[PDB]
Amino acid sequence: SLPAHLQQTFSPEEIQFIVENEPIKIFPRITTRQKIRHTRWQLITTDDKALNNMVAMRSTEVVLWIALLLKQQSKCSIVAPQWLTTKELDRKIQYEKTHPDRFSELPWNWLVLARILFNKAKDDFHDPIHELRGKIQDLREIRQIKVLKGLKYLNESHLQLDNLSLLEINELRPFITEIMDKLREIHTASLT
């Protein structure tokens, strides 16, 4: 009833679907806050209140799939989160290069949200988007080096991965879990 490739992991589209439930800041380009001096949003999964009280260019926070729906039309702009600016990503790059073992504390959704917003909101960034793409690429490459170091220390016992992304984890998950399972089964089998 569940396909083999979905049995013990998430598809990248499911990882996207998870990340799309996160709140994001938008500048509305419609006004829905009816003045004191008609259809309302009436949602059941998320905060209905913000969308019914939008005013144009008063920034407000909504769930990301609604922000993408409004940005498919010209009816909002999505404010790129503070970490995704050039200066912040450069600080994270310096952290990654300065601490060879720790992963830098980017948010768990960083690669997923970078991909989403670089595609669907390429015009909304204050910084030039080619630099943001370049530095997101720098971060992924440096973090992949750190992953390849970490996998030399797989155990039958456990492992710790402090600030690894949801996407990076989900990409590694079948390999790490299967190999550690087999190391366990070798070790436990040897016990009397």
Partner 1 sequence: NDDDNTEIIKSFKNFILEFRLDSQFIYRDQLRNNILVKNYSLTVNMEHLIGYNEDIYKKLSDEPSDIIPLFETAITQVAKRISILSRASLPTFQLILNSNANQIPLRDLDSEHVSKIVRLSGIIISTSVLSSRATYLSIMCRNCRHTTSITINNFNVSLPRSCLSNCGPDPYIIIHESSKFIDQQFLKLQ
Partner 2 sequence: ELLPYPHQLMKRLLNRISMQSQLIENISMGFLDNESKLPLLCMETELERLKFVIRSYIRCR
Partner 3 sequence: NGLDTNNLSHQEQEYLKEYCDLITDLKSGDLVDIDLSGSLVPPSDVFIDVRVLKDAGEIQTEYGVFNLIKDSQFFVRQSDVERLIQQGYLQKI
Q: Is 134 near partner 1 (CB under 8 A)?
A: yes
**Least gap, CB of 44 to partner 2 (angstroms):** 5
Contacts of partner 3 in 68-97 (CB under 8 A): 69
Q: Is 144 near partner 1 (CB under 8 A)?
A: yes
**Least gap, CB of 42 to partner 2 (angstroms):** 6
CA–CA gap between residue 91 and residue 98 (Å, rounded): 10
Tokens representing 135 are 């530095």
Q: Is 8 near partner 3 (CB under 8 A)?
A: no
Q: Is 141 near partner 1 (CB under 8 A)?
A: yes
Residues whose CB is less than 8 angstroms from the CB of residue 54 and which lie 6 or more positions away in sequence, other chains included = 28, 30, 31, 32, 33, 60
CA–CA gap between residue 96 and residue 93 (Å, rounded): 5
Q: Is 97 near partner 1 (CB under 8 A)?
A: yes
Residue 9 CB-density burial (10 A; 0-12 exposed, 13-18 middle, 19+ buried): middle
Tokens representing 4 are 């083999």
When the beta carbons of 72 and 137 are compared against partner 1, the nearer one is: 137
Residue 104 contacts which entry, partner 1, partner 3, partner 2, none (Cβ below 5-8 A, type-dependent): none
Q: Is 53 helix (H, G, I), strand (E, B) or coil?
A: coil
When the beta carbons of 14 and 105 are compared against partner 3, the nearer one is: 14
Contact between 75 and 29 under an 8 Å Cβ cutoff? The reply is yes
Q: Is 1 near partner 2 (CB under 8 A)?
A: yes
**Binding string to partner 2 for residues 117 to 136, with x set by CB under 8 A, is what?**
--------------------
Beta strands 76-78 and 23-28 are antiparallel
**Binding string to partner 2 for residues 43 to 82, with x set by CB under 8 A, is what?**
xxxx----x-------------xx--xx--x-x-------
Among 7, 8, 9, 11, binds partner 3 (CB under 8 A): 11
Contact between 122 and 129 under an 8 Å Cβ cutoff? The reply is yes
